[model samples]
Target: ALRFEALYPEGMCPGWSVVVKGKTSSNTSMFEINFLSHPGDQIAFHFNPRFASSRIVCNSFLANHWGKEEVNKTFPFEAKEPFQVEIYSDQDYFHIFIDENKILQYKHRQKQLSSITKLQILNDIEISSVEITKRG
Candidate 1:
């Protein structure tokens, strides 16, 4: 298993994006990315890719409970193959791209969207790079 965590105590806003390049583990069954809030330690956005089910699941964990999931049929990762993912947010939803193309979007659950200050990537992935870019 691979794990990465980044913290931006000042928080993140729209126009900022996280780009990740990695490969599925040899026996990758699941991998997940989480955007967490600084104060609550709650997950504002949860992106999950499941190899076994061949689906993408997105959700949020807030108020000590998990929210309804938004599942996507489009998953581009292949076994032991490299993949690139980019995620950003807007006033409404979080946008996700795979191989430089849009894949899915998850609507905002936390009202204080800018409070999302932590990024976590863990489980069943080999990392090439993880970059956070901002546009002024």
Candidate 2:
């Protein structure tokens, strides 16, 4: 039932980056990468790519509520194509890059940065690697 769940014991900080390398299936519809809080159901950052719509939707889910979705209409993903997704967390925003191209800046809403201890990737894509870098 679980696709991918990574634990960040040290949590996240400014300059922390998550690099995901994967490729969508030939008939992909959508996939998601979620930065989850210590408690379940509270997603600090939700990055979703919809191949059918050709849009990337970013949002947060807190207290059983889903926040407004920030849609990036300039899509960078394609079915059966390999891609890289990089997410950098700083003080106020998450800078997202797709295929090494800086694409989205998602403002921080779940302010407890250190509480984001988990990363989850849905099963819609094939994952080659997942790396987390923290600046000391």
lDDT (0 to 1) per candidate: 0.85, 0.86
TM-score, every prediction: 0.93, 0.93
Off by over 4 Å in 2: none
lDDT, candidate 1, 5-38, per-residue tens: 9988777756689999988865548889999996
Candidate 2 to truth, TM: 0.93
- TM-score quality measure for candidate 1: 0.93
Error (Å) of candidate 1 at residue 2 is 6.3
Model 2 has an lDDT value of 0.86
Candidate of highest lDDT: 2
Over the full model, what C-alpha lDDT does candidate 1 score relative to the true structure? 0.85
